[PDB]
Symmetry: D2
């Protein structure tokens, strides 16, 4: 039994709480049993209502009381980006295992403080880049590590969304630099960057453009009310030189009508190619050069028992993977590392590396030039 | 929020999906209609049961399902056993005044299904058959468009359920291949999902005309035993409202994993669904300007049926679990409100009568009228 | 390389596609089996014929097709008229020893189709029925995979041809909606293409069981006339080799434009084709390693059947024209080599017997065995 | 109706596609703006030339293209040679007062391209560069939507041209891999097509920032000559109208055959195009009701741009040739009407300047402003 203190029970609250409720039913025997012990929220009534909805034993309106609670094994940080650092540093000092939502923090420097706080402790630390644990993405990693597409030449990744494509969508914390740190870059590009690091390798250099299409939004009517500035990017595109000599690019936007949760990649290798589209996340597309010339092309592979993580999921391909299975796989690996005194990827080290890439992107965009990405060891 | 005590019978594949639905439903749909309590799970022996209770988070286990029926604390009996026990268990649970959700097919034959229906038809317990796929948000969305008149009158329906998990002859002779236990093969096991969908979206069947096929007549248990059910079924349909259609299901379609689909042609539009891409509904409106007319791919989210209880954006991703969660939500809403739910044992029994008429039709090679109730 | 003088009868829609094939075939398949010469075009009146000749690039026009039959320098007669003139023209052409390509359906009925077959069967002429879609390179590729055993033995076939050009009841009556001219509706006009494909890929039909529907029974000529043909056909099929299948065609599927498709299940793999994306063939091989198994999207080009005569890279793009070019190539090659071509009038006539059996089946609501030729 | 004598120079791949367009264009677009006469074809030697004339239906053949330029009765010169002869031939044709269509890229460099523009800009001749993919009906439909305001103001554009025909390093060192003949590799050969599409749909390029890659730096011809061009290009783009975007082209993407695509994001909708499925345009309108928004798959036909000249229903099927036919139609219409055509040598030259800016950008690793013609 590992006791979880969840901090924040907003748009993501449902997903985390599901992972903890469900993970043992999927991956059994379970290394440990997550217990939804206590949830913190911004005020006591909120916290109590969240605790009822998500099935937590206890509620608090002061997250510090979770840190000081010696019966709490795991702190799950699901607040806006401005509290990630302070909470994680307090939990690390109290010897807690930590899972933290992305982006790790607002900036590279702030993410550095979080990494520095966990680097030397005997705790499992994880950043919530859940999409790399889509079974189709794990499958792409398997094909690549096997050599089945040869050496990687080129990588394309997108994260295209449209939930704020209407300028009357309100000025939430995601549009305020002081809370979020960045816009599309921090909130969604980081997921793609993580996939790139996972599947291709480390970034050597970036060259980017940041765009804001909608500079003002209604404060939280038809947006006739008072308005505030958007001082973050709506959109980012960046070219990439990988340390291993592959090239690529990443594009993310909040302003692509028709695109809902369109995290995709295309990878070209010397002996084949892989395509993935999270809107059809059950599928991975793979083209092998070795196929006979008259029957050569992308195969649509549906993930199931035969594919990574399949032993813990559904008994046939296409029974259907949702967002929740990715969080379950995430929790499985997290609790497994804890139970075995091991560690998981992506960790705060990966979180910090992504934050350094983001800083380099921002700097590249500002100077209109190639910027070298520092590795976390510098 | 009242607690509703669930006794689950069966801890295999559906046991897990059902258990997830009970653990997750209030998280999803809040405030919840009622709070499910995983109170007792029954399994075939004490060690399995005990193991299952720990896996699925049930307060108690038992190796005798009758212990659940006789427990006055139990509000809900959830039948997730193979098809041969559905009837006994449901009839006992009804006689004890418990709400019932039963896996599909309702029972092995129409006659057996009739007994289950008769045991509930004069009561006001909530009774449900688990045709969960009609509660895919995309399918609910299709129902919405249809009921709105957005595709006009329905002319024609095509439904499939194509699978391949047993397309290898070396796949062994499980209960699903033995008539005595299953009642039928593809027909009972998967075509019923599609028949339900047709009843939900189009309306009642009037007549059927079918062909049943068995491609792999024996399988390993070393020694082998015979397959005495269908591997595949196809049937033409005359709907009571004058529409026409067909349904095809198979276990022998390489490349097809969980390919439950439909295509509907209305006088003012068409709708296409593919469960292997379940987040999508395809809809073509005749009313589109002539230079921008065609199927639009609609991803389900907050704006679509059940969207308030699901994920905050379209394509964050619906899997199998969400269908079972929505099923549980509705079942519990019926119980908390003293209402009924669709599909009920009435629906389950109507489907069993459609299956018998398909079998009869195939044997006689003629159209068979479907008995109504 | 001989010149072969073509006399084309009819200059409507198919006149254009036919004329392109004669103009283009040697550009594609070089050295060409022979050089088509667009010698004379017949149309319904002098002005129409002369205009057709200018547009389609024919040396001569006439308003009297018989003058083409009587011309000793015409080698090929190409029948592109409505269905009611196919038989008199083909029979006259056959009596004059001309090679003949005839549009589908071969004629209005089995009986009428039989008279055309009988007129050619004992002559040393090349006779062809223009089921061009089987010569989509993707469909030829499907045949190659099947012939090689690469999907094993065929269990099951599904074929469609869904259209919507007359889905609006305000679309006017044409000969296509008149039994006396067309012989049948969707059945003759489009399901024949699917039936041909089934015969090509799977084999001969043993029996059929069908339903014919008419959805829009009158159309504007304010005056209206009757539609006395089917808008829609569905049929189950028993194939002589023991496979089963079904075909469905309709004029009344909003969003479906030229949706000729098939899905074939074999013991070792599956093939799926969709003509709206004709460049593609989908194939699933059971032999793929278990973690990399499913449908491959194969784009046709140089490596695939007919690829030497087409574009130098896959997906440079096949349209309707290329199908008629390949058709013309094979036709002229047969003439040059003193051979036969498939599908011939024998094939045309078999399809007309399949159509007759489908119509009889729907009338009687029973299985009807398909006569062999 | 004027008959215009065409002198075609080159009988390779584009020679054939061009010939097809001249044979077919009047059949498609009738009454035609003018009738092309395939008068003379030039090839590298008399044997090739005469065989090309027999194959492509040309009346005369020559081994010397200058005798086409010097022939007073040739009205149109069509340049379908490799990139090294474009400028010489075009400048000669311009001076002889001929109308000119020239294959892409316009020439090997900015300066060569300039001399071609300078030679035609002040003459009363029609000049055209053969960026045929912008006349895919789907791309013309995209243009229509954009110019109507149906997707609002354009924010962002993504374009690709992914191929794999030389992904194998044993594929030989043809002219396309030799800088002194081609000028550049993927950039000039295929990125230019996407750069044209971007200019047509979005607007002029302001600046580029690029990376060029060579993956296979040597090829067979025992000895291996260097590949001294790019295999792949990627570039970011600032558009003069304030939109942003990127283009990526490669010869080294296994599974990608002729994958010229774009995605455009406007303030009120999005458009997506894939030439491997060229019959389709995908469009998402923000104006759709919240429960039925998404990309519509629109199949091009009579209702869409150029539809009057093409096939009578959507998805009868557009191939490569129809793009060349539309190109020829508009070229001949400009000549008949004393107009100009788009894209002209002005456009060809502007694309060559963009290519040079990309090359400069890659070498300097910095943003380069695109010079205006
Ligand atoms: N996805 C990522 O996950 C994180 C959360 O995103 P969402 O769930 O969509 O945001 P959200 O805005 O839906 O949820 C944030 C929650 O954190 C809570 N919160 C704010 N201050 C708090 C405090 N001092 N103590 C406890 N709770 C507090 C809020 O009341 C709110 O319920 C972000 O880092 C985001 O990038
Ligand atoms: N899907 C539907 O769901 C139902 C269950 O299918 P699956 O879960 O896929 O099959 P399954 O074979 O995975 O699970 C069935 C479970 O029922 C259990 N069982 C058998 N007899 C029992 C008894 N007397 N008491 C308690 N448990 C018993 C078995 O131990 C097994 O774990 C079927 O009707 C099927 O059509
Ligand atoms: N596709 C198939 O191709 C055939 C033609 O169809 P479409 O071209 O789409 O029809 P359509 O109606 O476009 O063309 C038929 C043509 O036949 C011509 N025609 C009728 N009677 C004639 C006569 N006695 N002599 C010469 N021409 C005559 C008409 O004037 C018309 O142009 C049909 O059998 C159809 O099933
Ligand atoms: N696509 C574009 O089309 C143009 C041609 O490409 P493809 O047709 O694919 O190349 P290709 O290599 O298929 O054909 C080019 C043709 O030009 C001919 N040619 C070379 N020198 C000549 C001369 N002095 N006189 C007459 N003909 C000559 C060659 O014999 C060859 O057949 C290129 O600019 C390319 O970028
Ligand atoms: O705001 C966009 C968002 O909710 O989109 C879905 C992603 O999974 C999540 O991390 C991200 O914050
Ligand atoms: O046997 C196949 C099966 O498990 O496939 C998945 C279906 O959801 C289920 O009802 C069915 O029994
Ligand atoms: O009328 C439908 C039709 O034109 O559709 C297109 C087919 O190619 C043709 O044979 C058929 O007659
Ligand atoms: O070399 C590749 C190529 O042939 O691919 C097809 C394009 O249409 C053409 O312009 C281009 O040169």
């Amino acid at each position: 039994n590992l006791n979880v203190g969840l901090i924040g029970g907003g748009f993501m609250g449902k997903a985390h709480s599901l992972a903890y409720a469900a993970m043992p039913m999927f991956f059994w025997p379970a290394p440990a049993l997550p217990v939804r012990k206590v949830i913190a929220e911004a005020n006591p009534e909120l916290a109590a209502e969240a605790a009822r909805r998500f099935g937590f034993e206890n509620s608090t309106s002061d997250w510090r009381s979770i840190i000081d609670d010696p019966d709490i094994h795991v702190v799950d940080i699901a607040t806006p980006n401005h509290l990630h650092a302070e909470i994680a540093i307090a939990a690390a000092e109290a010897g807690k295992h930590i899972i933290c939502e992305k982006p790790l923090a607002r900036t590279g420097e702030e993410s550095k403080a979080m990494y520095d706080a966990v680097k030397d402790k005997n705790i499992v630390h994880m950043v919530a880049f859940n999409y790399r644990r889509t079974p189709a993405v794990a499958l792409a990693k398997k094909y690549i590590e096997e050599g089945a597409i040869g050496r990687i030449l080129s990588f394309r990744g997108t994260y295209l969304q449209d939930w704020s494509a209407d300028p009357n969508s309100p000025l939430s914390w995601r549009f305020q630099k002081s809370i979020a740190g960045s816009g599309a870059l921090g909130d969604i590009a980081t997921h793609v960057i993580d996939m790139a690091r996972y599947l291709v390798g480390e970034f050597s250099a970036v060259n980017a453009v940041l765009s804001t299409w909608i500079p003002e939004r209604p404060l939280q009517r038809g947006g006739e009310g008072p308005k505030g500035p958007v001082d973050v990017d709506d959109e980012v595109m960046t070219m990439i030189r990988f340390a291993n000599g592959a090239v690529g690019s990443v594009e993310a936007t909040r302003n692509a009508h028709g695109r809902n949760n369109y995290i995709t990649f295309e990878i070209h290798g010397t002996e084949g190619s892989i395509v993935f589209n999270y809107e059809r996340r059950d599928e991975l597309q793979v083209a092998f050069a070795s196929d006979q010339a008259d029957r050569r092309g992308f195969r649509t592979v549906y993930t199931g028992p035969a594919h990574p993580y399949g032993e813990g999921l559904w008994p046939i391909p296409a029974l259907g993977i949702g967002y929740g299975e990715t969080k379950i796989i995430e929790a499985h690996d997290f609790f497994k590392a804890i139970a075995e005194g091991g560690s998981v990827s992506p960790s705060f080290a990966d979180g910090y590396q992504v934050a350094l890439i983001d800083d380099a992107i921002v700097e590249s965009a500002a100077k209109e030039s190639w910027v070298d990405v520092p590795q976390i060891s510098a």
